[PDB]
Amino acid sequence: MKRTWQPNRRKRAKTHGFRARMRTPGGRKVLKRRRQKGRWRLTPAVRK
Amino acid sequence: AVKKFKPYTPSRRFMTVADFSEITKTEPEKSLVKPLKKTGGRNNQGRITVRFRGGGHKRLYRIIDFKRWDKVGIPAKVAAIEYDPNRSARIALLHYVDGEKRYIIAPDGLQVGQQVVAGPDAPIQVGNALPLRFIPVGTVVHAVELEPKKGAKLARAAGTSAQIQGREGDYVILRLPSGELRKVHGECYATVGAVGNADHKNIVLGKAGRSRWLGRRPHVRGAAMNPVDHPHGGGEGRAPRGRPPASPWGWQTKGLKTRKRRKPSSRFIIARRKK
RNA sequence: CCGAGGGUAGGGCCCGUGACUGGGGCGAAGUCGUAACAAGGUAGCUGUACCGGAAGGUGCGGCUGGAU
RNA sequence: UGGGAGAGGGUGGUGGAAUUCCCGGAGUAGCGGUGAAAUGCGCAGAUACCGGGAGGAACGCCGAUGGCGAAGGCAGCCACCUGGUCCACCCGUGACGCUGAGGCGCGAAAGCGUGGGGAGCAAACCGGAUUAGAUACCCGGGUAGUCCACGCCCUAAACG
RNA sequence: CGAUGUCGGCUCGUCGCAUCCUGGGGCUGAAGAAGGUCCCAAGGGUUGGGCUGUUCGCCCAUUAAAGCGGCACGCGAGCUG
RNA sequence: GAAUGCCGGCAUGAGUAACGAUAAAGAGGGUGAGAAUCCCUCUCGCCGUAAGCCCAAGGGUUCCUACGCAAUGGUCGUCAGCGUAGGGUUAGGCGGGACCUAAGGUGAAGCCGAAAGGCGUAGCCGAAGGGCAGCCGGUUAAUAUUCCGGCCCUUCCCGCAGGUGCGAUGGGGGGACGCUCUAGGCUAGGGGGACCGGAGCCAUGGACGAGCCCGGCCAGAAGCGCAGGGUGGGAGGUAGGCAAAUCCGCCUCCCAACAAGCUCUGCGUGGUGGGGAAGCCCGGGUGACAACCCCCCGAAGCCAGGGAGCCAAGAAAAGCCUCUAAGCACAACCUGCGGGAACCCGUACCGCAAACCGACACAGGUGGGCGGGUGCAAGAGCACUCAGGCGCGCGGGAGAACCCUCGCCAAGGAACUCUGCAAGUUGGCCCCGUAACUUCGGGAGAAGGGGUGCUCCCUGGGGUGAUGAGCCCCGGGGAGCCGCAGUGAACAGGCUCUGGCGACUGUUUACCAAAAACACAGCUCUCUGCGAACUCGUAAGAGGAGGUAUAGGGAGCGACGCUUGCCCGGUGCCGGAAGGUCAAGGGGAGGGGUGCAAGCCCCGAACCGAAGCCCCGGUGAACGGCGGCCGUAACUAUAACGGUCCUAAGGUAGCGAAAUUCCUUGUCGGGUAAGUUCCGACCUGCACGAAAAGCGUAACGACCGGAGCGCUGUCUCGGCGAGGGACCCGGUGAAAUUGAACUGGCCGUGAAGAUGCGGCCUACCCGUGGCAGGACGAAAAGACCCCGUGGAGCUUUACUGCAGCC
RNA sequence: GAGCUAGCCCUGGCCAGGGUGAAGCUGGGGUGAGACCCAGUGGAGGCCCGAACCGGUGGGGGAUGCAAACCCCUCGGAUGA
Numbered sequence A: 001m002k003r004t005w006q007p008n009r010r011k012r013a014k015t016h017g018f019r020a021r022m023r024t025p026g027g028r029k030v031l032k033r034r035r036q037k038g039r040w041r042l043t044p045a046v047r048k
Numbered sequence B: 001a002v003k004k005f006k007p008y009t010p011s012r013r014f015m016t017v018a019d020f021s022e023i024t025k026t027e028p029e030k031s032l033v034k035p036l037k038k039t040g041g042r043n044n045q046g047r048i049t050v051r052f053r054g055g056g057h058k059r060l061y062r063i064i065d066f067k068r069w070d071k072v073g074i075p076a077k078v079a080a081i082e083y084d085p086n087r088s089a090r091i092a093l094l095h096y097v098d099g100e101k102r103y104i105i106a107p108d109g110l111q112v113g114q115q116v117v118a119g120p121d122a123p124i125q126v127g128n129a130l131p132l133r134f135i136p137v138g139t140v141v142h143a144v145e146l147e148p149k150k151g152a153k154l155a156r157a158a159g160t161s162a163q164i165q166g167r168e169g170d171y172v173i174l175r176l177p178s179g180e181l182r183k184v185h186g187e188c189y190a191t192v193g194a195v196g197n198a199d200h201k202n203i204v205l206g207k208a209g210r211s212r213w214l215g216r217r218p219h220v221r222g223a224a225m226n227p228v229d230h231p232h233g234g235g236e237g238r239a240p241r242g243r244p245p246a247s248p249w250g251w252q253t254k255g256l257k258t259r260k261r262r263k264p265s266s267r268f269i270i271a272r273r274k275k
Numbered sequence C: 001c002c003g004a005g006g007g008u009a010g011g012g013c014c015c016g017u018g019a020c021u022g023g024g025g026c027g028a029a030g031u032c033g034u035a036a037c038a039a040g041g042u043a044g045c046u047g048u049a050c051c052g053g054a055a056g057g058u059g060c061g062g063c064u065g066g067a068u
Numbered sequence D: 001u002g003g004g005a006g007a008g009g010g011u012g013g014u015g016g017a018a019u020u021c022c023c024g025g026a027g028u029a030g031c032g033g034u035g036a037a038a039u040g041c042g043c044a045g046a047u048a049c050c051g052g053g054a055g056g057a058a059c060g061c062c063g064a065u066g067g068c069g070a071a072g073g074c075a076g077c078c079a080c081c082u083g084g085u086c087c088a089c090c091c092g093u094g095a096c097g098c099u100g101a102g103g104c105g106c107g108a109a110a111g112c113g114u115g116g117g118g119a120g121c122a123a124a125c126c127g128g129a130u131u132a133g134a135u136a137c138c139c140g141g142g143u144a145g146u147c148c149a150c151g152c153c154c155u156a157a158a159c160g
Numbered sequence E: 001c002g003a004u005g006u007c008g009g010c011u012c013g014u015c016g017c018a019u020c021c022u023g024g025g026g027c028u029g030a031a032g033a034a035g036g037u038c039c040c041a042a043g044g045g046u047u048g049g050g051c052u053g054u055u056c057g058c059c060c061a062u063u064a065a066a067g068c069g070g071c072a073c074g075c076g077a078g079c080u081g
Numbered sequence F: 001g002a003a004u005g006c007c008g009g010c011a012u013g014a015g016u017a018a019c020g021a022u023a024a025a026g027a028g029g030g031u032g033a034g035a036a037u038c039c040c041u042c043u044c045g046c047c048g049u050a051a052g053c054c055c056a057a058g059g060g061u062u063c064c065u066a067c068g069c070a071a072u073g074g075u076c077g078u079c080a081g082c083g084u085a086g087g088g089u090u091a092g093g094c095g096g097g098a099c100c101u102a103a104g105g106u107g108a109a110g111c112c113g114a115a116a117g118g119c120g121u122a123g124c125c126g127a128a129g130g131g132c133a134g135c136c137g138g139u140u141a142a143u144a145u146u147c148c149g150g151c152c153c154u155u156c157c158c159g160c161a162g163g164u165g166c167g168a169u170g171g172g173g174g175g176a177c178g179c180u181c182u183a184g185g186c187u188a189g190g191g192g193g194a195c196c197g198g199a200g201c202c203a204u205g206g207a208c209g210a211g212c213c214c215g216g217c218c219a220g221a222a223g224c225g226c227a228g229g230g231u232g233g234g235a236g237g238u239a240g241g242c243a244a245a246u247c248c249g250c251c252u253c254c255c256a257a258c259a260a261g262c263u264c265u266g267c268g269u270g271g272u273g274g275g276g277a278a279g280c281c282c283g284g285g286u287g288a289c290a291a292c293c294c295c296c297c298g299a300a301g302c303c304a305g306g307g308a309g310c311c312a313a314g315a316a317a318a319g320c321c322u323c324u325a326a327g328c329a330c331a332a333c334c335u336g337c338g339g340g341a342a343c344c345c346g347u348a349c350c351g352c353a354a355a356c357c358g359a360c361a362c363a364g365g366u367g368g369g370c371g372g373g374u375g376c377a378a379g380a381g382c383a384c385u386c387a388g389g390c391g392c393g394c395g396g397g398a399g400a401a402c403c404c405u406c407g408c409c410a411a412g413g414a415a416c417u418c419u420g421c422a423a424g425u426u427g428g429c430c431c432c433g434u435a436a437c438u439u440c441g442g443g444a445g446a447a448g449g450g451g452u453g454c455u456c457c458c459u460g461g462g463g464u465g466a467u468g469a470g471c472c473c474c475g476g477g478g479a480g481c482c483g484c485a486g487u488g489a490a491c492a493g494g495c496u497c498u499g500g501c502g503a504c505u506g507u508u509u510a511c512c513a514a515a516a517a518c519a520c521a522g523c524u525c526u527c528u529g530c531g532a533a534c535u536c537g538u539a540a541g542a543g544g545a546g547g548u549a550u551a552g553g554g555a556g557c558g559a560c561g562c563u564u565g566c567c568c569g570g571u572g573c574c575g576g577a578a579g580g581u582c583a584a585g586g587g588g589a590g591g592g593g594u595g596c597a598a599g600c601c602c603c604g605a606a607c608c609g610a611a612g613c614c615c616c617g618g619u620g621a622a623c624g625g626c627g628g629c630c631g632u633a634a635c636u637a638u639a640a641c642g643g644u645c646c647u648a649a650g651g652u653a654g655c656g657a658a659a660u661u662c663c664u665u666g667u668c669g670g671g672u673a674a675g676u677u678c679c680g681a682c683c684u685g686c687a688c689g690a691a692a693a694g695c696g697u698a699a700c701g702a703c704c705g706g707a708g709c710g711c712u713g714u715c716u717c718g719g720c721g722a723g724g725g726a727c728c729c730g731g732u733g734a735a736a737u738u739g740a741a742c743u744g745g746c747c748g749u750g751a752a753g754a755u756g757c758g759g760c761c762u763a764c765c766c767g768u769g770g771c772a773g774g775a776c777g778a779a780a781a782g783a784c785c786c787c788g789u790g791g792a793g794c795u796u797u798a799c800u801g802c803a804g805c806c
Numbered sequence G: 001g002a003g004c005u006a007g008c009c010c011u012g013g014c015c016a017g018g019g020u021g022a023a024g025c026u027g028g029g030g031u032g033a034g035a036c037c038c039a040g041u042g043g044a045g046g047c048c049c050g051a052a053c054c055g056g057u058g059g060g061g062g063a064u065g066c067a068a069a070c071c072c073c074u075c076g077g078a079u080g081a
């Protein structure tokens, strides 16, 4: 049947992307958090 | 006037459509139209603030001249009479001798090829606009400004009219389409005659689908829902209301008046609406 | 080939009969009231409408076959 | 051909009397209603009186035992559109007539459909009396309807 | 109650005997035929349908007869639902 | 040593289930250490509106070549989407950017919010919409509208010539639009040819033929031809298009009108550039100087912004054209020709799937285009088949029970069962014919029948062409032939009568309910005069609505028909400038503290004092409610009638053992041999009833009842047969479960149902195929039930608050 | 977090074939003129049959599945809400 993951490169970058994170206060604390934890990538990688 | 159909489907039995016998021009004036932003009853938050709306036919908005005191003294000719899907009335195309074109809403009896005009010196003739001060007492009028230079606000639905009962001071006394007796300022403009397409109220939609075409989505009763949804929700099997009949938001809906008590216009309303 | 008729299927008319149900006629001495004939005690009759245990009443309009 | 009388019919316009309601004033202890009363209404200011406003319906005197129409029926006043009819003159056609099964049309009230409109009146209905009772007569209320438009119904003591 | 699946049906039986039939008896208000009542007896047998979820019951047509109960109201790691 | 403990390791079940669509395989020859599994060949089968081909998304080297086989691959493996290495993606014209706007997003101005932030005009962003210049063939192991060949085209810069009042983010025109149906003429594609080109072929009884088999084109600038779209010319006035304007709009006058003209597309032709089959021979080469023509069918695509009808009335902006203003007219723009200039990103490959989403090489899910032929009335349906692509990554045997999917069945024909559940029957087309009832449409495919193939003969009309031939398309009549049977295969309704519910088409509990539920047109009540009411938001601001009472909110009811009675005492709502109560505030009789005192400070009655409540009215398609007892008629029985108690008022019409009736399978009637269901009635309605609508109603229904016909393996009552499993052999090899086990029956006993205790009986040791009575078998710390001063959703005249409103 | 699902907004796309035959228009008849009747034309519809597409009615299978909702037969809608 139709499942829940239907990938979409534009939907991915616009929803979870770096600039979406930087626009809102909760988005920045996400990056701040993941930087503090030492995540190798702060944001889903997407080809574009 | 109201066409009927033979019962060749279950819905054609009752379905009626307007005769459109007054329309002379079947495509709009390109310079007087602009896109109508369909909202679906959603505000700038994206929230449904008026329920059960959406899905109706695409429409172009026709810019309508509700002032007419722009062109005092400049006569116009009645060029055509056209369909307007944004309102119940029909609209009238005017070729001003200026060469300017505008739409007005078509009064009953307006004939294509007639001259109309607006202003204090205007003839008391269907389609002419004067300030309320200068129209004889007893004349049926429409498209009435509520305040001077603020635009026609009253009596523009199909078939409606307001009658001039009398005047006192700077104010005249009108009987609105609802039957309210109200003072309106004498400088306010209005157009003599009643709005056309009187047979509009005798149309039978005939089936659910016509409601869907008009942008009207199905309306679900309170008694049909659950208590989390509505005062009338719940119950085992069917159920009477079991409380004063109420809106989705609590307030009572059988007689409870809701006009603001201290509203400054109360001084100008003489008698509340009839019936 | 036609062909008495037989069979399958569907219709039309008539007759008998049917739990029950509707009013009708008739029936020496039932119960309720008194509508009509006298202005019959609210003049009557009336077509229609609504109503009431029942006759009836009432509205609207009509007739005199209505009295004084 | 020339004339006449008429509530004949249809459409639109419009005039005053009256009733109800609304607003203002002035004023107070009742008004109303009946055989008698009660219900009802009134000091939260009614009834009676004056000025103002809104709306509906019906047209007083003329008015008659009168007039018009085939019948049902038609009554303020004005204009338009239209039918029938009578008299005069003796001008034209030359029996072109009478009746009329079917057909078609009109057809009071009440009633029905869809819009209106709603002052007065008033089936139903409520209340007060009367009464053994009173699903009545009498009184206080009162919804359809009565009014307009379109479309049905097609009945009658539709009678001379 | 850190679960013993709960009616009825179908399938498959097996047991008890307080015996419905068939076998053997005594008594009879047993002439015969046919019944009644009781004793012995569990080997075998104990039908098909209409109605209702039904068990049960009633009815139709038969029959030697159309028995009553137990087996977790026998039997859902066998079916049904 | 236990915590259904935690982490790891290893067992048991077990050489067991399974190895992922039943489209299917067989042999030969290669390679190699090794082969059912890799390569090649021949035979066989499967898809063919795909299981073929091309885009898009997503994936991200998986593409090609060489060398490999530990792991991955459900077996094997020499193979591979796997490992290692090398190679491979080429554009002014294709897609996107250097262009435009849509929703939306952002957002100078501005507005709002404790902070964070929320809004917001223009503007900006934003595409699969608008706009814009490349088609055919060749080439690589792997890219190609990209390289190459041929023939075309766009933009920018500069120059030359000619021309003109040039000039814009401003004005205007245009761009520019729906649904259904559709004309003419084309092209795509296809069928045929006794014509043209071709390596060949004569078989097995016949045929050397007007034989069989193969092919018979693609692209193209100017010009020309056919078919279309678009489009009036001139003049005078002008106040309107937020400056100007010669443009546009409006008025008038002249001439031209289904034209013509001009302009723009499509198709055809066109210099020219290509391609080119079977068959044979080793992808190639040949065929080949390949031929490249005629007729027919023909689009949903093209001309296109075509036409007609209808109502629900169908984006924007730029490119483009025109008007002008600053400015400038050494300019600048327009046209023609020439040279030069032309950037960034994608391009491999998979793409209905083994490369995407589903943890898997997973019978599931995934948007667009092409989708050939013949027959069957049509078609994308069905059968077979082309091009192309596959035989689904375990096999070989055997021919038990039992399971699945399938075929048939004597006599009977629903006796099966909760139920005809299931499975039969019927089945397309043409013709004949078709009932109650009805809202006149329908019911209707009612029901029920007849026909259906092939051959010969005669003949009617249409399309093309020419009017004729040919080809193609609808038919009509007559005579015959064969079989059990002619929609001979495949695809393709069983029917009827009568109830309940719901008017209807629709909608729903994604994943146990599709319904009688929700919706629905229609009816009513009610609120709302516009800065509307109402809704979201602290606000600003939005929606309502660029709407205005024939409109918008809320509520109930639910097409339509005939109707919708009585109660306003209580609750709600509506009306009521009196009276009653009423907070803060006003007022200050009168007291108190303190000071020598002036004073400072505190308490405080009458009285004035809103809404709300009380009070007086109205109001039911507002919340709601609509009696009891006793008696009475000349047979009996029963009460039209009466008496009395109570009520705010005592249930009207219609309907009734009902989706409602407890007693109940009520009683009577119909239907049946028999009817707890069904239908029709009666009425003591436990406990119908009038918009939580009452009573009906044609049509409709994968709804739920009852009956009949047809026909059947549902059944009496089972039998046989087919394939896929089960079984045996080789390969790979799980699982829940598991205190340990050397794990029998009876009658007892035991915490009350014992393999484990007692007594007795029975029993050599170990398996395999089978059946499910026990192991109170497994699974899930019972959902029922109770308990916990556990939790959560919901309600209200429970308490107490808050929003909101007054 | 609305890449599942629900509704709405913007912009595109899809719906083989066959069947029924409303209004209108034309002609004829009719009448004082009409209503209206007949034939032809026409091609309306939350109309009919049926693929794609969208569904999920009944039954069977599957149940440590091919699948954490699937497969087969059957069935509903298919110009419209």
Ligand SMILES: [Mg+2]
Pocket (backbone or CB within 6 Å): A002
């Ligand atoms: Mg889904």
Ligand SMILES: [Mg+2]
Pocket (backbone or CB within 6 Å): none
């Ligand atoms: Mg997942």
Ligand SMILES: [Mg+2]
Pocket (backbone or CB within 6 Å): A006, G003
């Ligand atoms: Mg998606």
Ligand SMILES: [Mg+2]
Pocket (backbone or CB within 6 Å): A008, A009, A010, A011
């Ligand atoms: Mg994307």
Ligand SMILES: [Mg+2]
Pocket (backbone or CB within 6 Å): A010
């Ligand atoms: Mg995208």
Ligand SMILES: [Mg+2]
Pocket (backbone or CB within 6 Å): A008, A010, A011, A012
């Ligand atoms: Mg996206």
Ligand SMILES: [Mg+2]
Pocket (backbone or CB within 6 Å): A014, A015, A020
């Ligand atoms: Mg976002």
Ligand SMILES: [Mg+2]
Pocket (backbone or CB within 6 Å): A013, A014, A015, A016, A017, A018, A019, A020, A021
């Ligand atoms: Mg982003």
Ligand SMILES: [Mg+2]
Pocket (backbone or CB within 6 Å): A025, F116
């Ligand atoms: Mg912050």
Ligand SMILES: [Mg+2]
Pocket (backbone or CB within 6 Å): none
């Ligand atoms: Mg910061």
Ligand SMILES: [Mg+2]
Pocket (backbone or CB within 6 Å): none
């Ligand atoms: Mg990580």
Ligand SMILES: [Mg+2]
Pocket (backbone or CB within 6 Å): A040
């Ligand atoms: Mg790093």
Ligand SMILES: [Mg+2]
Pocket (backbone or CB within 6 Å): A016, A021, A030, A042, A043, A044
């Ligand atoms: Mg992140």
Ligand SMILES: [Mg+2]
Pocket (backbone or CB within 6 Å): B003, B004, B005, B006, B012, B013, B014, B015, B016
């Ligand atoms: Mg109609």
Ligand SMILES: [Mg+2]
Pocket (backbone or CB within 6 Å): B006, B007
């Ligand atoms: Mg009709």
Ligand SMILES: [Mg+2]
Pocket (backbone or CB within 6 Å): B018, B019, B020, B021, B022, B023, B090, B197
């Ligand atoms: Mg009109």
